[PDB]
Amino acid sequence: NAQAEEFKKYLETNGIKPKQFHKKELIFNQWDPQEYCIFLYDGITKLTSISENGTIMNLQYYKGAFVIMSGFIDTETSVGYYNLEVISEQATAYVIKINELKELLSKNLTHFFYVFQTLQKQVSYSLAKFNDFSINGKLGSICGQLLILTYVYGKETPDGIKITLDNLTMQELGYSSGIAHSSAVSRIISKLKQEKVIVYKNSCFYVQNLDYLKRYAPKLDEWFYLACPATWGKLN
Amino acid sequence: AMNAQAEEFKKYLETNGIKPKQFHKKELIFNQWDPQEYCIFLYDGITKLTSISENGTIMNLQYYKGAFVIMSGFIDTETSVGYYNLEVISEQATAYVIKINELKELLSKNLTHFFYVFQTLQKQVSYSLAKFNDFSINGKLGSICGQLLILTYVYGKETPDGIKITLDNLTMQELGYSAVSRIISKLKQEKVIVYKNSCFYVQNLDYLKRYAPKLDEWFYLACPATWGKLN
Ligand SMILES: Cc1ccc(Cc2cc(=O)n3c(c2[NH+](C)C)SC[C@H]3C(=O)O)c2ccccc12
Ligand SMILES: Cc1ccc(Cc2cc(=O)n3c(c2[NH+](C)C)SC[C@H]3C(=O)O)c2ccccc12
Ligand code: NA
Numbered sequence: 347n348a349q350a351e352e353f354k355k356y357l358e359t360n361g362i363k364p365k366q367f368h369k370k371e372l373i374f375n376q377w378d379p380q381e382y383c384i385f386l387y388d389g390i391t392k393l394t395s396i397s398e399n400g401t402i403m404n405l406q407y408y409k410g411a412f413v414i415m416s417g418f419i420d421t422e423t424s425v426g427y428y429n430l431e432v433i434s435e436q437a438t439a440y441v442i443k444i445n446e447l448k449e450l451l452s453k454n455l456t457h458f459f460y461v462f463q464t465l466q467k468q469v470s471y472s473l474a475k476f477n478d479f480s481i482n483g484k485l486g487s488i489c490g491q492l493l494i495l496t497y498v499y500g501k502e503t504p505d506g507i508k509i510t511l512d513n514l515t516m517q518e519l520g521y522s523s524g525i526a527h528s529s530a531v532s533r534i535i536s537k538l539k540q541e542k543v544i545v546y547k548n549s550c551f552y553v554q555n556l557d558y559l560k561r562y563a564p565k566l567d568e569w570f571y572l573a574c575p576a577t578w579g580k581l582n
Numbered sequence: 583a584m585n586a587q588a589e590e591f592k593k594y595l596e597t598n599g600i601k602p603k604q605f606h607k608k609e610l611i612f613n614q615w616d617p618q619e620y621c622i623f624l625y626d627g628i629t630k631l632t633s634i635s636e637n638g639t640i641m642n643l644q645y646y647k648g649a650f651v652i653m654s655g656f657i658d659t660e661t662s663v664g665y666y667n668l669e670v671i672s673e674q675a676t677a678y679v680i681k682i683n684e685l686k687e688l689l690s691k692n693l694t695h696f697f698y699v700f701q702t703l704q705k706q707v708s709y710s711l712a713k714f715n716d717f718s719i720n721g722k723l724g725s726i727c728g729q730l731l732i733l734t735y736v737y738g739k740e741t742p743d744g745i746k747i748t749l750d751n752l753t754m755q756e757l758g759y760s761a762v763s764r765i766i767s768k769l770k771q772e773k774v775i776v777y778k779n780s781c782f783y784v785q786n787l788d789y790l791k792r793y794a795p796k797l798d799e800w801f802y803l804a805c806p807a808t809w810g811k812l813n
């Protein structure tokens with residue numbers, strides 16, 4: 347990702363070193379009074395929250411390279427009581443105090459635009475998810491999740507589009523944002539497997555019916571086409 | 583009820599020769615079939631983002647009220663972020679309509695206003711996640727409670743009849759006021775709301791807060807001064 351690579355170089359040019367995190371660590375947390383801009387360079391994370399119950403809610407997934415901001419750029423205060431949890435075995439991120447992100451974007455509108463554009467992708471992502479859920483329910487949500495996994499990690503092979511992610515992490519990601527390991531979601535996913543939309547073979551998973559995923563997640567398909575046209579184009 | 587950053591953004595646009603435009607109910611400030619994309623500075627009024635299927639069914643995706651910024655195209659590429667319309671649902675709305683290419687020049691010469699627009703995106707992002715969180719906990723009751731809570735915070739007025747949502751009746755029906763019916767009746771039948779004299783009144787604000795906790799937190803975090811009027 348070229349635009350992201352230039353942002354990494356811009357961060358290091360201003361003396362910002364990367365930090366390494368491990369699965370289950372929090373890059374930022376809902377209790378910290380200080381808010382941050384995270385430039386997630388490599389790895390996979392989820393945004394989580396907690397209800398009074400202590401129930402962990404998975405709200406959103408992010409992969410490197412991407413920007414996640416836990417506070418508003420102007421007030422520097424929280425956008426919500428969120429944690430950013432690493433779910434890949436390792437992740438690399440640049441962790442900047444929000445007051446400094448401001449200074450840096452102030453001096454290079456190209457990198458301002460890069461971060462601005464990431465927020466725009468998030469906004470339209472959530473609206474597309476809402477639309478697909480409003481049309482097709484949890485099946486739209488799950489097909490959308492699988493569809494984005496296929497486009498981001500899939501590689502065409504004779505056996506179909508192989509998901510090139512370790513099986514451990516992949517099965518976590520098959521679950522859409524919401525409650526942890528919902529049985530209703532597990533049944534949806536295994537039903538797609540039973541119908542051979544995604545199939546296990548020789549220790550790997552292959553999407554063999556991409557059209558089915560596109561059918562039930564049409565608005566996330568359009569979102570990805572509009573948001574990441576080159577990646578979309580590779581498998582269409 | 584003055585939004586200082588929005589007022590300063592408005593001065594900034596008008597001294598760069600961008601003029602306000604009026605729209606009436608049902609007009610599309612931008613539409614899903616237009617290849618040209620825009621930055622909308624919605625200064626006054628209420629709108630809804632929609633998507634229209636080939637089938638012709640209209641999906642209501644998001645509501646916006648002035649003052650706010652809605653961008654139909656990505657700032658860098660200038661291409662669509664989604665096949666969306668911005669439909670006016672108040673009787674009139676006022677908006678500044680800026681071609682996406684022209685916006686890039688402006689936010690670049692002023693960083694305070696760049697940040698104002700950036701922050702509106704952040705408010706939309708966190709809004710959607712909070713909406714999702716309340717629906718995951720409380721399903722449709724949470725969604726409806728959240729919509730009523732925001733309406734109460736933004737438009738509510740103290741009256742002997744409760745907290746009156748001060749929107750003319752035509753706008754309320756544009757907002758939705760079968761399975762929704764099943765919920766709204768539970769709410770009247772438990773005292774939470776009442777419709778009187780063709781007006782809408784909240785009488786158990788705590789109930790709404792109970793079932794839309796994450797949107798309540800969003801509003802506390804995003805609009806503290808307004809939230810504080812009823813907390
Ligand atoms: C399985 C899965 C689904 C969805 C997301 C979220 C996601 C993916 C993605 O590729 N992009 C974005 C998002 N959201 C942040 C909107 S923003 C633009 C684009 C990008 O990363 O450049 C997943 C993310 C990581 C891993 C799996 C995902
Ligand atoms: C009933 C109803 C619900 C939600 C919204 C959306 C909304 C309201 C709001 O007050 N704010 C925002 C939103 N979203 C755009 C995130 S962003 C921060 C704040 C603001 O306007 O400054 C409604 C909007 C208008 C009318 C009714 C709404
Ligand atoms: Na935090």
Ligand code: NA
Pocket residue numbers: 578579580581582
């Ligand atoms: Na192609």
Ligand code: NA
Pocket residue numbers: 612613614615616617618619654662666
């Ligand atoms: Na358009």
